[PDB]
Amino acid sequence: MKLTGEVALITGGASGLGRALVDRFVAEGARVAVLDKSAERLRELEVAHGGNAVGVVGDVRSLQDQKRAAERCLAAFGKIDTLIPNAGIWDYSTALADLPEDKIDAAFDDIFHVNVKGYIHAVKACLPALVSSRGSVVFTISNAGFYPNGGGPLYTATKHAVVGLVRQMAFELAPHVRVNGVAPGGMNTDLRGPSSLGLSEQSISSVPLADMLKSVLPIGRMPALEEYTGAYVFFATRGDSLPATGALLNYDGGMGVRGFLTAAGGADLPEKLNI
Amino acid sequence: MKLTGEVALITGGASGLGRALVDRFVAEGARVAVLDKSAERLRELEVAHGGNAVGVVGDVRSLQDQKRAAERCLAAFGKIDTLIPNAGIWDYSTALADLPEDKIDAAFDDIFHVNVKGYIHAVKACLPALVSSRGSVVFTISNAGFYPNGGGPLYTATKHAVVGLVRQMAFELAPHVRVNGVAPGGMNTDLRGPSSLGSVPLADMLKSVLPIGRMPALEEYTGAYVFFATRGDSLPATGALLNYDGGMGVRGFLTAAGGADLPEKLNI
Amino acid sequence: MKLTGEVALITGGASGLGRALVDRFVAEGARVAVLDKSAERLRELEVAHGGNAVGVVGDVRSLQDQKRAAERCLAAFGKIDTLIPNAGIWDYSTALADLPEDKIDAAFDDIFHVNVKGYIHAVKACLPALVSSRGSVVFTISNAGFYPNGGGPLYTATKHAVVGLVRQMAFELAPHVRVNGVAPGGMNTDLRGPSSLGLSEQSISSVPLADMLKSVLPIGRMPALEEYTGAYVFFATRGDSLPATGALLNYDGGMGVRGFLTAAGGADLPEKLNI
Amino acid sequence: MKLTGEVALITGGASGLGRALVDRFVAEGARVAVLDKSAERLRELEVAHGGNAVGVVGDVRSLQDQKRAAERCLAAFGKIDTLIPNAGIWDYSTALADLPEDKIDAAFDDIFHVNVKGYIHAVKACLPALVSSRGSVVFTISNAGFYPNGGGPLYTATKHAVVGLVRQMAFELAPHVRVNGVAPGGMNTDLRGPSSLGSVPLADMLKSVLPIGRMPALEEYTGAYVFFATRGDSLPATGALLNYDGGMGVRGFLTAAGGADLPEKLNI
């Protein structure tokens, strides 16, 4: 186990990547606290992992719930080694032109409150525990944090913003707490949009992501959620990622190195070297 | 005069970088519309520039006030060629540890509303006019949009966030409207912060910070904007990011600059 | 004139972008020295510009010729305000698999000698004059200096390398000489490949660049060479670019902000806002 | 043991970062082939690791020596899963002003030949085996591949150049072979330079330089490579760049780190 005796706090861990993360982290010897708004799914993750997992119902936008999550984690486990702010909301790539005027201000607050403020409240709440442990923060970014076309202006703005927290928090929490970001590509999760845009109940699993991403990713397929948890274990392992603070790992099937006419340069290499 | 017949709309153009831009765009033969919250400072630029300026007293956070900036720019001048969303707010470099739990929620909103939403509203408000003139957007960023230590978590994330609007608005507004970002640093503007809040001077730390070894006057930050607003010079450029901070990101570990003793070394 | 009384030295200025640059710079009040290997084209540029242009035959790979170019510039004009290293060679995007083993080492030296060493020798030679003038260096990069698919490993490596000289030379020549890079996209020039690859006599003007780039650039067309000179005037104007050292201006029709399924997001905006 | 059944080929794996990698990959259950110019140091790792290593004494600049590294890795172990081109040469941070006109031409070649061509030859030599195992390449970069002041013009351009091989080889070797770069800094390796040449210590400047506030042992730089060579953990990642330098690019203007007084501030 890369991670025996380590203690993680993960927000948005009752679905999608945050759940796979929880599963992975427990399989690696860690004990995990989850702050999520989803009551039933938090209990589902608790009964799956038998004491190695604590689940706290609450909102990432409330510092208080976040503080509660920290407190419960400390009460359940003794410490926090790794903070993984992760809970998130999409805009479904609604362009600026298509953001209705009566809806922009509300959509703005909703997406930024979860995506950016939710991250800031995770760090504020866990700060005393992370300095105590010399632990580390790993933020879930996205390809939308580096290149356009992965979300509308709201969402691309929020992910670019977390890159800004990666850097500012690596600076500010040094030398006691390390700060890094993982930037996953498309995932088959239960990612939702905001009420403003009537996307509360739209789920990204309902979008033909696997179909689309086959054409676009150099690596010629969308990874399974299992395969997006590895990078987080890396940053959560003391002995492996000690020299990394400030790090931005693009973890997206190579969206930033794709070609202009094809995603991949070497589909026919095996036969070009004729094996 | 590089911009004769061109019309700009500049938000936060009544003080600091924004005033220097008004003056410069007006001196280049451009006519300028200005949305600023400072009515008295809007007065002064209106007297300064005759009919070559119009101010609208509004808040960059209000989409409607933004609409009136645009519409009044259209009524005065007939078009908008270049939009410079520029209004912004700083956090005094307040470290997360030092943001009070009871202030953090409002202060997040105040800073992100002006700095980010404000930029979004300015574009949204100017979209039909820009697409019509096939114009250009130049957002003002900051060194804090790329490197730590130019603001706390709130400011830095706001300025990283606008790096994102550059790229996504470049993509989205193409092929009609070009979108770029200028990232100034090294200024000593009277950049203030929100009510929510009540950091050693740039002079005190310049040798560890600015390879250029000097503090440029505001007027020296105007040229990049003129360039990105000149269609005959900046046409290839959309999505671009111009670090304009005196070399902050190319500074040395022990000193900002490494060739202080060049003239004496090269016998100059 | 943005540039009255200014003095430029441009390498590779007898063809393609370097020529347009020369033309532009003279139209802007500047006097221009050109180091190029092309004898006849250097004389052609001299007779076009009547005293405002000096041309020196020589190779960018020889420090000596480069020194000669500096000397001639000083003799002709009195000073050097702006150094524009620019001469270059392409690999035509020959993939690693297609670089023959008997040819890699020679192709390596040729492309790196021109693309990177040629730049280093321009700066070494003009250094005394640029400190004297407090002038500035502007390197011609490329999109191949930022993203793949604009050249093979050799060429993408050389352009990434000049990004490295942008940064190291902005640092090292501060506070007396500013250092910046412009990174143009595809251009209809007379860009050649190396002898090793039998590309000496292949010209990029013979590649359907305009056709290809129509699909790929957000801006929906390849710019004319006239329209790639503006950025250089910006960096060559004292009063406009004084706070820029270290700067990297992507100047390529928006290759880094293109979409996954289309280059541009807003082909049908006029009708979306219905004008 | 994270890499049981996996085979790596590591160039410059007989000292510094490369030796730490050999040891670490061997301790993870991997079998390792090593191309290094240092025959005596190749001896020591051969005795250190029993049959779990093989060295070939060669030069990373020679395509043929590279071919024998690969082929001998195949004869010994049957496959290559992970190639770590890692051999490199520094310039002592020799400033351009200080590169002698008579040395500059050779020194350009020596440094670029090992550092860049060497990386190219290693991949080229290992291409049929990597594509066959659907493996991965991890080039060693450097802080000098991103920020100034970790080498003169020659070194820095060499390490920026490898950032380019990452992206172009990611593109070109896809979808079969993933290519990433690790960029270490903050080490105190015995990094030497070319004959052509005959810079204050990291200890002397650490507080302006490393937010982590400490000098990590070599062994602490191995984990990222293990990660990028573990197919079940690093599969999404191709073209990636992992800054692994203690936070050099996220350091402050006046001090590297900004929360030195956190424990006392948070009452820890």
Ligand SMILES: NC(=O)c1ccc[n+]([C@@H]2O[C@H](COP(=O)([O-])OP(=O)(O)OC[C@H]3O[C@@H](n4cnc5c(N)ncnc54)[C@H](O)[C@@H]3O)[C@@H](O)[C@H]2O)c1
């Ligand atoms: N899914 C993708 O394509 C993708 C790609 C890149 C990055 N990301 C990022 O991955 C992260 C995880 O999202 P996901 O993709 O697993 O979607 P998901 O909806 O399946 O998981 C996100 C979790 O966030 C929780 N959550 C949302 N708002 C909350 C709130 N206000 N308070 C408490 N909990 C809240 C939800 O209950 C859910 O369990 C987000 O940061 C997302 O932007 C997603």
Ligand SMILES: NC(=O)c1ccc[n+]([C@@H]2O[C@H](COP(=O)([O-])OP(=O)(O)OC[C@H]3O[C@@H](n4cnc5c(N)ncnc54)[C@H](O)[C@@H]3O)[C@@H](O)[C@H]2O)c1
């Ligand atoms: N200080 C630096 O070195 C530095 C560096 C990079 C970028 N900047 C940026 O430069 C841009 C211009 O600011 P400045 O530095 O010139 O500071 P400034 O305060 O002198 O100028 C800001 C202007 O914006 C106006 N403004 C502020 N909030 C507003 C609102 N809500 N609605 C309407 N108008 C509003 C102010 O009244 C003022 O006229 C900002 O985006 C700032 O973030 C400053």
Ligand SMILES: NC(=O)c1ccc[n+]([C@@H]2O[C@H](COP(=O)([O-])OP(=O)(O)OC[C@H]3O[C@@H](n4cnc5c(N)ncnc54)[C@H](O)[C@@H]3O)[C@@H](O)[C@H]2O)c1
């Ligand atoms: N053309 C493109 O698509 C493109 C795109 C981005 C960047 N660039 C860069 O633009 C620059 C200019 O090249 P171009 O596109 O105008 O091609 P070009 O061949 O038309 O111009 C380049 C000039 O370099 C000169 N030159 C080449 N080798 C030389 C040597 N060893 N010594 C002296 N002079 C030499 C040639 O004579 C020629 O006049 C290069 O740095 C190139 O990589 C080109």
Ligand SMILES: NC(=O)c1ccc[n+]([C@@H]2O[C@H](COP(=O)([O-])OP(=O)(O)OC[C@H]3O[C@@H](n4cnc5c(N)ncnc54)[C@H](O)[C@@H]3O)[C@@H](O)[C@H]2O)c1
């Ligand atoms: N010093 C730092 O902080 C730092 C930072 C980032 C990256 N690096 C890089 O780490 C990598 C490993 O180097 P190191 O720092 O461990 O230094 P090192 O000298 O201790 O290791 C280099 C190894 O490469 C071998 N080598 C050198 N030239 C060779 C050649 N031409 N052919 C074959 N083998 C050759 C040497 O014999 C030695 O075993 C290099 O790419 C170096 O550039 C060092």
Ligand SMILES: Oc1cccc(-c2ccccc2)c1O
């Ligand atoms: O972070 C993200 C979250 C959700 C979707 C995407 C996405 C990207 C490209 C195409 C379609 C969706 C994304 O990047």
Ligand SMILES: Oc1cccc(-c2ccccc2)c1O
């Ligand atoms: O710098 C460059 C020089 C020559 C060609 C390209 C290019 C890029 C994309 C597609 C085709 C050619 C390039 O980027």
